[PDB]
Coordinates of all heavy atoms in Angstrom, one line a residue:
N5 N -12.2 49.1 -26.7 CA -13.7 48.7 -26.7 C -14.1 48.6 -28.2 O -14.5 49.7 -28.8 CB -14.6 49.4 -26.0 CG -14.4 49.3 -24.4 OD1 -13.4 48.7 -23.9 ND2 -15.5 49.6 -23.7
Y6 N -14.2 47.4 -28.8 CA -14.6 47.4 -30.1 C -16.0 47.8 -30.3 O -16.4 48.5 -31.3 CB -14.3 45.8 -30.6 CG -14.8 45.5 -32.1 CD1 -14.1 45.8 -33.1 CD2 -16.1 44.9 -32.1 CE1 -14.5 45.5 -34.3 CE2 -16.5 44.6 -33.4 CZ -15.7 44.9 -34.5 OH -16.1 44.7 -35.8
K7 N -16.9 47.3 -29.4 CA -18.4 47.6 -29.4 C -18.5 49.2 -29.6 O -19.2 49.6 -30.4 CB -19.0 47.0 -28.3 CG -18.9 45.6 -28.0 CD -19.6 44.9 -29.3 CE -19.8 43.4 -29.0 NZ -18.6 42.7 -28.6
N8 N -18.1 49.9 -28.6 CA -18.2 51.3 -28.5 C -17.5 52.1 -29.7 O -18.1 53.1 -30.1 CB -17.8 51.9 -27.2 CG -18.4 51.1 -25.9 OD1 -17.6 50.9 -25.1 ND2 -19.6 50.9 -26.0
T9 N -16.5 51.5 -30.2 CA -15.9 52.2 -31.4 C -16.8 51.9 -32.6 O -17.2 52.8 -33.3 CB -14.6 51.6 -31.5 OG1 -13.8 51.9 -30.4 CG2 -13.9 52.4 -32.8
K10 N -17.2 50.6 -32.8 CA -18.0 50.2 -34.0 C -19.2 51.0 -34.1 O -19.4 51.6 -35.2 CB -18.4 48.8 -33.8 CG -19.5 48.3 -34.6 CD -19.7 46.7 -34.5 CE -21.0 46.2 -35.0 NZ -22.1 46.6 -34.3
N11 N -20.0 51.1 -33.1 CA -21.3 51.7 -33.3 C -21.1 53.3 -33.4 O -22.0 53.9 -34.1 CB -22.3 51.3 -32.2 CG -21.8 51.7 -30.9 OD1 -20.8 52.4 -30.7 ND2 -22.5 51.2 -29.8
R12 N -20.2 53.7 -32.7 CA -19.9 55.3 -32.8 C -19.5 55.6 -34.2 O -20.0 56.5 -34.8 CB -18.8 55.6 -31.8 CG -18.5 57.1 -31.8 CD -17.7 57.5 -30.7 NE -16.3 56.8 -30.7 CZ -15.3 57.1 -31.4 NH1 -15.6 58.1 -32.3 NH2 -14.2 56.5 -31.4
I13 N -18.7 54.9 -34.9 CA -18.2 55.0 -36.2 C -19.4 55.1 -37.2 O -19.6 55.9 -38.1 CB -17.2 54.1 -36.7 CG1 -15.9 54.5 -36.1 CG2 -17.0 54.1 -38.2 CD1 -14.8 53.4 -36.3
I14 N -20.5 54.1 -37.0 CA -21.4 54.0 -38.0 C -22.4 55.1 -37.8 O -22.9 55.7 -38.8 CB -22.3 52.7 -37.7 CG1 -21.3 51.4 -38.1 CG2 -23.5 52.6 -38.5 CD1 -21.9 50.2 -37.6
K15 N -22.6 55.6 -36.6 CA -23.6 56.7 -36.2 C -23.1 58.0 -37.1 O -24.0 58.6 -37.5 CB -23.7 56.9 -34.8 CG -24.9 57.8 -34.4 CD -24.8 58.2 -33.0 CE -24.9 56.8 -32.2 NZ -26.2 56.1 -32.4
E16 N -21.8 58.2 -37.0 CA -21.4 59.3 -37.8 C -21.4 59.2 -39.2 O -21.9 60.1 -40.0 CB -19.9 59.7 -37.5 CG -19.7 60.0 -35.9 CD -20.5 61.2 -35.6 OE1 -20.8 62.0 -36.4 OE2 -20.8 61.3 -34.4
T17 N -21.1 58.0 -39.7 CA -21.0 57.8 -41.2 C -22.4 58.1 -41.9 O -22.5 58.8 -43.0 CB -20.6 56.3 -41.5 OG1 -19.4 56.1 -41.0 CG2 -20.7 56.1 -43.0
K18 N -23.5 57.6 -41.3 CA -24.9 57.9 -41.9 C -25.1 59.4 -41.8 O -25.9 60.0 -42.6 CB -26.0 57.0 -41.2 CG -26.2 57.5 -39.8 CD -27.6 57.1 -39.3 CE -27.5 55.6 -39.2 NZ -28.8 55.1 -38.6
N19 N -24.5 60.1 -40.8 CA -24.8 61.6 -40.8 C -24.0 62.3 -41.8 O -24.4 63.4 -42.4 CB -24.4 62.1 -39.2 CG -24.8 63.4 -39.1 OD1 -24.1 64.3 -39.4 ND2 -26.0 63.6 -38.6
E20 N -22.8 61.8 -42.1 CA -21.9 62.5 -43.1 C -22.1 62.1 -44.5 O -21.4 62.6 -45.4 CB -20.4 62.1 -42.7 CG -20.0 62.7 -41.4 CD -18.6 62.4 -41.1 OE1 -18.1 61.4 -41.6 OE2 -18.0 63.1 -40.3
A21 N -23.2 61.3 -44.7 CA -23.4 60.7 -46.1 C -23.7 61.9 -47.2 O -24.5 62.8 -46.8 CB -24.6 59.7 -46.1
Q22 N -23.0 61.9 -48.3 CA -23.2 63.0 -49.2 C -24.2 62.6 -50.2 O -25.0 63.3 -50.7 CB -21.9 63.2 -50.0 CG -20.8 63.8 -49.0 CD -19.4 63.8 -49.6 OE1 -19.1 63.2 -50.6 NE2 -18.5 64.7 -49.0
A23 N -24.1 61.4 -50.8 CA -25.1 60.8 -51.7 C -25.7 59.6 -51.0 O -25.2 58.8 -50.3 CB -24.5 60.2 -53.0
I24 N -27.1 59.5 -51.3 CA -27.9 58.5 -50.5 C -28.7 57.7 -51.5 O -28.9 57.9 -52.6 CB -28.9 59.3 -49.5 CG1 -29.6 60.5 -50.2 CG2 -28.1 59.9 -48.3 CD1 -30.8 60.0 -51.0
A25 N -29.4 56.7 -50.8 CA -30.1 55.7 -51.6 C -31.1 56.3 -52.6 O -31.9 57.1 -52.1 CB -30.8 54.7 -50.6
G26 N -31.0 55.9 -53.8 CA -31.9 56.4 -54.9 C -31.3 57.4 -55.6 O -32.0 57.9 -56.7
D27 N -30.1 58.0 -55.3 CA -29.5 59.1 -56.0 C -28.9 58.5 -57.2 O -28.4 57.3 -57.4 CB -28.5 59.7 -55.2 CG -29.0 60.6 -54.1 OD1 -30.1 61.1 -54.3 OD2 -28.2 60.8 -53.2
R28 N -29.1 59.2 -58.4 CA -28.3 59.0 -59.6 C -26.9 59.7 -59.5 O -26.9 60.9 -59.2 CB -29.0 59.3 -60.9 CG -30.3 58.6 -61.1 CD -29.9 57.1 -61.2 NE -28.8 56.8 -62.0 CZ -28.8 57.0 -63.4 NH1 -29.9 57.4 -64.0 NH2 -27.7 56.7 -64.0
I29 N -25.8 58.9 -59.7 CA -24.4 59.5 -59.4 C -23.5 59.2 -60.6 O -23.8 58.2 -61.4 CB -24.0 58.8 -58.1 CG1 -22.7 59.5 -57.7 CG2 -23.8 57.4 -58.3 CD1 -22.4 59.2 -56.3
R30 N -22.6 60.0 -60.8 CA -21.3 59.6 -61.4 C -20.2 59.6 -60.4 O -20.2 60.5 -59.5 CB -20.9 60.5 -62.6 CG -22.1 60.8 -63.6 CD -21.5 61.3 -64.8 NE -22.5 61.6 -65.8 CZ -23.0 62.8 -66.1 NH1 -22.8 63.8 -65.4 NH2 -23.9 62.9 -67.0
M31 N -19.2 58.8 -60.7 CA -18.2 58.6 -59.7 C -16.8 58.5 -60.5 O -16.7 57.8 -61.5 CB -18.3 57.3 -58.9 CG -17.2 57.1 -57.8 SD -17.6 55.5 -56.9 CE -19.1 56.0 -56.1
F32 N -15.8 59.2 -60.0 CA -14.5 59.3 -60.7 C -13.5 58.8 -59.8 O -13.1 59.1 -58.7 CB -14.1 60.8 -61.0 CG -15.2 61.4 -62.0 CD1 -16.3 61.9 -61.5 CD2 -14.9 61.5 -63.4 CE1 -17.2 62.7 -62.3 CE2 -15.8 62.1 -64.2 CZ -16.9 62.7 -63.8
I33 N -12.9 57.6 -60.3 CA -12.0 56.7 -59.5 C -10.5 57.0 -60.1 O -10.4 56.8 -61.3 CB -12.3 55.3 -59.3 CG1 -13.7 55.2 -58.9 CG2 -11.4 54.6 -58.4 CD1 -14.2 53.7 -58.6
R34 N -9.7 57.3 -59.2 CA -8.2 57.3 -59.6 C -7.7 55.8 -59.7 O -7.5 55.1 -58.8 CB -7.5 58.0 -58.4 CG -8.0 59.5 -58.3 CD -7.0 60.2 -57.4 NE -7.6 61.6 -57.1 CZ -7.0 62.6 -56.4 NH1 -6.1 62.3 -55.5 NH2 -7.5 63.7 -56.2
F35 N -7.6 55.5 -61.0 CA -7.3 54.0 -61.3 C -6.1 53.9 -62.0 O -5.9 54.4 -63.2 CB -8.6 53.6 -62.1 CG -8.7 52.1 -62.4 CD1 -9.0 51.3 -61.3 CD2 -8.5 51.6 -63.6 CE1 -9.1 49.9 -61.6 CE2 -8.6 50.3 -63.8 CZ -8.8 49.4 -62.8
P36 N -5.2 52.9 -61.6 CA -4.0 52.7 -62.3 C -4.3 52.1 -63.7 O -4.8 50.9 -63.8 CB -3.2 51.7 -61.5 CG -3.8 52.0 -60.1 CD -5.1 52.3 -60.2
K37 N -4.0 52.8 -64.7 CA -4.4 52.4 -66.1 C -3.8 51.1 -66.6 O -4.4 50.5 -67.5 CB -3.8 53.5 -67.1 CG -2.4 53.7 -67.3 CD -1.9 54.6 -66.1 CE -0.4 55.0 -66.5 NZ 0.2 55.9 -65.4

């Protein structure tokens, strides 16, 4: 069931969010030089 999987995944993601809209952030990306 794509439907039930899709919306279930989204519902958790907004709950697990660490940084949220309007936050000032720095981000460190493992980047092949």
Side-chain angles (χ1 to χ4, degrees):
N5 286 21
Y6 178 81
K7 300 300 196 300
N8 305 133
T9 303
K10 152 171 177 286
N11 59 9
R12 186 168 61 79
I13 289 175
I14 293 167
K15 191 185 304 291
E16 297 304 332
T17 297
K18 69 166 64 178
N19 189 270
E20 292 181 339
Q22 297 170 339
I24 51 72
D27 288 339
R28 295 305 313 289
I29 187 166
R30 315 196 177 98
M31 184 180 292
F32 298 82
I33 303 188
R34 299 185 181 177
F35 189 74
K37 64 281 195 180

